[PDB]
Amino acid sequence: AYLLFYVEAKVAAAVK
Amino acid sequence: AYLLFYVEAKVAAAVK
Amino acid sequence: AYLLFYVEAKVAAAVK
Amino acid sequence: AYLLFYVEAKVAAAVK
Amino acid sequence: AYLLFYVEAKVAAAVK
Amino acid sequence: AYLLFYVEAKVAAAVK
Ligand SMILES: [Cl-]
Ligand SMILES: [Cl-]
Ligand SMILES: [Cl-]
Ligand code: NA
């Protein structure tokens, strides 16, 4: 899957 | 405006 | 030293 | 409504 | 001084 | 065990 950072504030990491 | 990440700790997003 | 972001969740900054 | 703190980690506030 | 928690979201501590 | 909040900043929960 893809590694991403996004804004939720804090910058959060996710793997979708 | 410009999209930026900066350190505040957590990494924070801002649009200046 | 090196500037890095890592995942701890939130994205955190460190200088090692 | 009710004022509450809960654990999400960090302690988060909510008003339900 | 006084110890307090407040909402900034996360619950944050301060001493005023 | 005991439920506690402490300051780490954010207020964090722990069970010791
Ligand atoms: Cl927010
Ligand atoms: Cl800090
Ligand atoms: Cl977590
Ligand atoms: Na946080």
Burial class (CB in 10 A: 0-12, 13-18, 19+), C5: middle
In terms of CA atoms, which chain A residue is nearest residue C12? A11
Burial class (CB in 10 A: 0-12, 13-18, 19+), D11: buried
In terms of CA atoms, which chain D residue is nearest residue F10? D10
> Does residue B15 sit at the A interface (CB-CB below 8 Å)?
no
The label of the residue with tokens 């804004």 reads: A7
Distance between CA D16 and CA D11 in Å, rounded? 16
Structure-block tokens of residue A12: 């959060």
Distance between CA B9 and CA C5 in Å, rounded? 11
Residues of chain F with Cβ-Cβ distance to E5 below 8 Å are: 11
Burial E1-16 (b: 16+ CB within 10 A, else e): eeeeeeeeebbbbeee
> Does residue B16 sit at the A interface (CB-CB below 8 Å)?
no
Instruction: Find the farthest-apart pair of alpha carbons in chain D and give their distance in angstroms, rounded.
Output: 25
Burial B1-16 (b: 16+ CB within 10 A, else e): eeeeeeeeebbbbeee
Strand partners, B15: B3
Angle CA C10–C15–C16, to nearest 5: 115
> Does residue D14 sit at the E interface (CB-CB below 8 Å)?
no
Q: What resolution (Å)?
A: 2.0
Distance between CA C14 and CA C6 in Å, rounded? 8
